[PDB]
């Protein structure tokens, strides 16, 4: 309703860097809010793509941001009569970024790994890795739960069980309030997908440079399955956290599996032991139901609700014709130990190929009326197809079907405006929460400020 579309602030990264692919707000120990931006195709210092991360201090005028340094050198370790190898070329550092407390977690989902032993190998595969930084001290740590030292032949002899070689850990990420990092790894277990959880504190305290394979004792990974419904499901393509069992002592996980059950798609709500509490099935095959997931209480009753995006959903039209527009499903959490029912609301895109529901961002309370709000991206929407972000205000009934406001892309065709979104943080300290929108195709980020 009240985001100002005229006085925008633009931050920009290097050409071809994909600056804006991922982003988050970061609050320092002094409480000052900055913006963390991922740029997964940024050139490293040897002109090879490695990705990178930028930390933008808030300024009305915007501009260029300093690059948050990480080690981009490959590592080799000869130990235990084996040779361990990390490969950082084309790793996509900054494909996801998340901030918690005074820590930034930036992941490189396509970082590769191999282990050699005589004439045998593990296979050179994208295990992924996350880089953790504490800017105000300079501390650095890493976490790569899918690296192993098992040779190829052993997976063959064991029918490829617990095969974590293609995890792409950090493909998605979220951090609980208590400081547990939860990473989505959709390639896990031969493309079923998996989740990896560890406390940030324990990641830092157990990491030393050059070790490459080390133990985080508090870590917890999800499980392999022989259920073919899960095969190639990409469970962990998206991830979120929330409160869904009425017990505030436990944290629940929300996991998107957009190709689950022969591309029907699904989203699951799980406890922190990874026991399924509920499953929400997709409506239409190949719609990518579970591409995005968001958690926020929208109807003011204090119980978290769930929003799921299916950006390739095809809507029925005259004479048995279908139009790919995208869809968003709202599930309101009921009272007591009851399941989530059918959707309370379906929001559907209007522009062909617009990919509405590609990103969904909780905005907090944008208009300060007592109900939380959301923003939904359609990165190729609007009449020109340049991209659009749509604001929906919460109410007693849940959400309004009509957006309170539409933000049209200020960037040219191809920018993917809205592909990433974050709100619910007041960057300029005016008392209203603001919205940051990434346009990785234009290597830029737009900041919209909420007004009285």
């Amino acid at each position, epitope marked *: 309703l009240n985001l100002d579309p005229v006085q925008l602030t633009f931050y920009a990264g290097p050409n071809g860097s994909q600056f804006g692919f991922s982003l988050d707000f970061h609050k320092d120990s002094h409480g000052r809010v900055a913006i963390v931006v991922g740029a997964p195709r940024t050139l490293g210092p040897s002109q090879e793509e490695t990705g990178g991360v930028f930390l933008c201090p808030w300024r009305a005028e915007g501009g260029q941001c300093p690059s948050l340094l990480f080690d981009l050198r490959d590592e080799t370790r000869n130990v*235990g*009569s084996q040779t361990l190898q990390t490969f950082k070329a084309r790793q996509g550092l900054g494909a996801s970024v998340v901030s918690w407390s005074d820590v930034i977690v930036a992941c490189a989902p396509w970082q590769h790994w191999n282990v050699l032993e005589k004439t045998e190998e593990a296979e050179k595969t994208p295990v992924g890795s996350c880089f953790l930084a504490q800017p105000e001290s300079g501390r650095r740590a890493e976490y790569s739960p899918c690296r192993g030292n098992t040779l190829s032949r052993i997976y063959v002899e064991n029918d490829f069980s617990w095969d974590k070689r293609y995890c792409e850990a950090g493909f998605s990420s979220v951090v609980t309030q208590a400081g547990e990092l939860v990473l989505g790894a959709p390639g896990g277990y031969y493309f079923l997908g998996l989740l990896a959880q560890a406390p940030v504190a324990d990641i830092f305290s157990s*990491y*030393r440079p*050059g*070790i490459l*394979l*080390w*133990h985080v004792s508090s870590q917890s990974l999800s499980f392999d399955s022989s259920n073919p419904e899960y095969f190639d499901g990409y469970w962990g393509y998206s991830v979120a956290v929330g409160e869904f069992d009425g017990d505030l002592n436990t944290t629940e996980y929300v996991v998107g599996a957009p190709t689950w059950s022969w591309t029907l798609g699904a989203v699951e709500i799980l406890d922190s032991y990874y026991q399924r509490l509920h499953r929400l099935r997709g409506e239409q095959m190949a719609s990518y139901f579970g591409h995005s997931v968001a958690v926020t209480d929208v109807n003011g009753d204090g119980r978290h609700d769930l929003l799921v995006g299916a950006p390739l959903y095809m809507e029925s039209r005259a004479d048995r014709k279908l139009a790919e527009v995208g869809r968003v499903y709202l599930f309101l959490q009921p009272r007591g130990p009851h399941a989530l029912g059918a959707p309370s609301l379906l929001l559907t895109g209007t522009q062909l190929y617009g990919r509405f529901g590609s990103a969904i961002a909780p905005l907090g309370d944008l208009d300060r009326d007592g109900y939380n709000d959301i923003a939904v991206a359609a990165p190729y929407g609007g009449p020109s197809g340049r991209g659009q972000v749509l604001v929906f205000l919460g109410q007693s009934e849940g959400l309004r079907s009509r957006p309170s406001q539409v933000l049209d892309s200020p960037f040219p065709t191809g920018s993917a405006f809205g592909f990433s979104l974050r709100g619910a943080v007041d960057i300029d300290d005016n008392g209203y929460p603001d919205l940051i929108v990434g346009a990785y195709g234009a290597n830029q980020v737009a900041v919209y400020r909420a007004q009285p």
Partner: antibody
Amino acid sequence: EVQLQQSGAELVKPGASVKLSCTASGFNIKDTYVHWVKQRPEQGLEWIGRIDPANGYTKYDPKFQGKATITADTSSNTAYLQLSSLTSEDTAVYYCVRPLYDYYAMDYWGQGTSVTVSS
Amino acid sequence: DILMTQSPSSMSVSLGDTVSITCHASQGISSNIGWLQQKPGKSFMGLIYYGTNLVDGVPSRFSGSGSGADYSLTISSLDSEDFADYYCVQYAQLPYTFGGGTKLEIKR
């Protein structure tokens, strides 16, 4: 607190077998590699082998291949070392060992189990 | 197998001394070395892993150094509790192999 709790002192006859045990306390035995090491006064410290209790895979020093068998049971959170064809050279103190962080390190040790081979 | 040669086999030293124990490997082991302590009549405690990293809880007076085939454990300002046996172990290769040890003795 990580602690490796080994079984008691053994007095055993030559030609016989003995099975030592190492129970994990304050962690799960499958968390890391578990190693077995032998100590004698004169000959010093010798690595016998290791197990990955998650899957049962073992490595041995060739000097102990055929004498030593390492096993583990995740149900009881215990690792075992069995020594067959006991000789006077097997009179020693035996330790189980696991790393702290580094997969390949040797950081945490049990209290030791004394084995005396005698007629 | 990799031979670990540790020196000296003993030393007679005093409280407050700074002392170094060396370990020479028969080939390069690129910092894949641990240092261990055994107090009289006791079991082992790990001091250092991967050349220079202190095991959690170990006092700051212990430090590791070296590269290639040659490493050192240094104890700065000896405590009464430091008169013990010390060993290196390599894990560059299987089989893991140990040094012959160094006993810190009290000078009088």
